[PDB]
Amino acid sequence: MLTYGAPFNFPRWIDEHAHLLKPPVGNRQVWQDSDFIVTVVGGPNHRTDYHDDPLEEFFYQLRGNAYLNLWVDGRRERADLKEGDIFLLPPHVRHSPQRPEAGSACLVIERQRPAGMLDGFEWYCDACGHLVHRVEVQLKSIVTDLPPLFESFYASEDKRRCPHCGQVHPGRAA
Amino acid sequence: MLTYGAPFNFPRWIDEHAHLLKPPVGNRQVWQDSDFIVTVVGGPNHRTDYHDDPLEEFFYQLRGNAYLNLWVDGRRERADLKEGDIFLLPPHVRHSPQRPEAGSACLVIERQRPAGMLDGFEWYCDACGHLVHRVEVQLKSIVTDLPPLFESFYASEDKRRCPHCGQVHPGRAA
Ligand SMILES: [Cl-]
Ligand SMILES: [Cl-]
Ligand SMILES: [Fe+2]
Ligand SMILES: [Fe+2]
Ligand SMILES: [Fe+2]
Ligand SMILES: [Fe+2]
């Protein structure tokens, strides 16, 4: 059977989920229980966490503009996702998506992670650039597996304290 | 490093590869040596083979219209990929993409198959619907692994002969 239903018009679907493509929800997965995790991500949303994905991530910025803060070659860098850009991110490149625009919409495609292949989420010190904290997770459902993780970082000065310079990371907002 | 390069404008890329999005080439893979196989498929192209993909296939018909001839629930069916449609095909659903329109362009996303996970390509009898022939392949490079397969079916009345009714399948054109 067509487990995932018939084809359907993507722009209309994005329009009809506009109320979810903004805070507090911000994104919406298109199909459930698939190997390909296909998500539309709206805005605005800024964040301070860096994602260490053990597999590739595909981006197609359909509407509006965004950017990825990255660590590449040991430096902080930015990759801009201008409206109409596509991009393939290699495994493990640390990235922190920033989505300043309301009404923006990005197609993001990932793979289900097999058991034992963990995702990393980490924060870096704004003063000295040292790793402040890292949590690894077996990512099964982002709705339940990720928000508490971020919440526990914001709530702990211990977790936010830079082991190098002692600066306490701001937490939720940069 | 950004192994797969920086983000870039997808519509412009499609425009600049127009000469490849038509016969005899018809398609073009966006990045090489990636886990995600990301292809843009043009037209026109009709075909008689059905693909048995051991993993999912994602479609986003960016420009123009196409359709997939399918076998679902034991019947011949069609899924239309109208301009703007997206679609996720479950593993193993037999499909034969038909792309009648020049200037059309479909984003197709697949996964590298691990060793031992084979793709099937098969043809069905127009008279009685029985399986006429099936080849399984370890799909590594579609440029070298698939054209000879189709070529050997067209060249063999033996391969094209229906074991049920004896009808010799037409081969290349329906
Ligand atoms: Cl994102
Ligand atoms: Cl196709
Ligand atoms: Fe990510
Ligand atoms: Fe620090
Ligand atoms: Fe296929
Ligand atoms: Fe037959």
From Swiss-Prot, chains A, B:
Assembly with partners or alone: Homodimer.
Binding site for Fe cation 2: C125, C128, C162, C165
Protein's gene: nbaC
Activity regulation, per record: Inhibited by 4-chloro-3-hydroxyanthranilate. Mechanism of inactivation involves the oxidation of the catalytic active site Fe(2+) to the catalytically inactive Fe(3+) oxidation state, superoxide production, and formation of two disulfide bonds between Cys-125 and Cys-128, and Cys-162 and Cys-165. Enzyme can be reactivated under reducing conditions.
Pathway annotation: Cofactor biosynthesis; NAD(+) biosynthesis; quinolinate from L-kynurenine: step 3/3
GO terms under biological process: anthranilate metabolic process; L-tryptophan catabolic process; NAD biosynthetic process; quinolinate biosynthetic process
Full protein name: 3-hydroxyanthranilate 3,4-dioxygenase
Co-factor note (free text): Binds 2 Fe(2+) ions per subunit.
Record field: catalytic activity: 3-hydroxyanthranilate + O2 = (2Z,4Z)-2-amino-3-carboxymuconate 6-semialdehyde
Recorded coiled-coil stretches: none
Binding site for Fe cation 1: H51, E57, H95
The entry's keywords: Dioxygenase, Iron, Metal-binding, Oxidoreductase, Plasmid, Pyridine nucleotide biosynthesis
Gene3D superfamilies referenced in this protein's UniProt entry, alphabetically: Jelly Rolls
Names of the cofactor(s): Fe(2+)
Organism: Cupriavidus metallidurans (strain ATCC 43123 / DSM 2839 / NBRC 102507 / CH34) (Ralstonia metallidurans)
Xref: HAMAP family: 3_HAO
Recorded consequence of changing R47A: Increases KM for 3-hydroxyanthranilate 7-fold. Decreases activity 1000-fold
EC numbers: 1.13.11.6
Binding site for substrate: E57, R99, E110
Assigned protein family: Belongs to the 3-HAO family.
Record-linked PANTHER family: 3-HYDROXYANTHRANILATE 3,4-DIOXYGENASE
Transmembrane regions: none
Function statement: Catalyzes the oxidative ring opening of 3-hydroxyanthranilate to 2-amino-3-carboxymuconate semialdehyde, which spontaneously cyclizes to quinolinate.
GO molecular function, one term: ferrous iron binding
Binding site residues for O2: R47
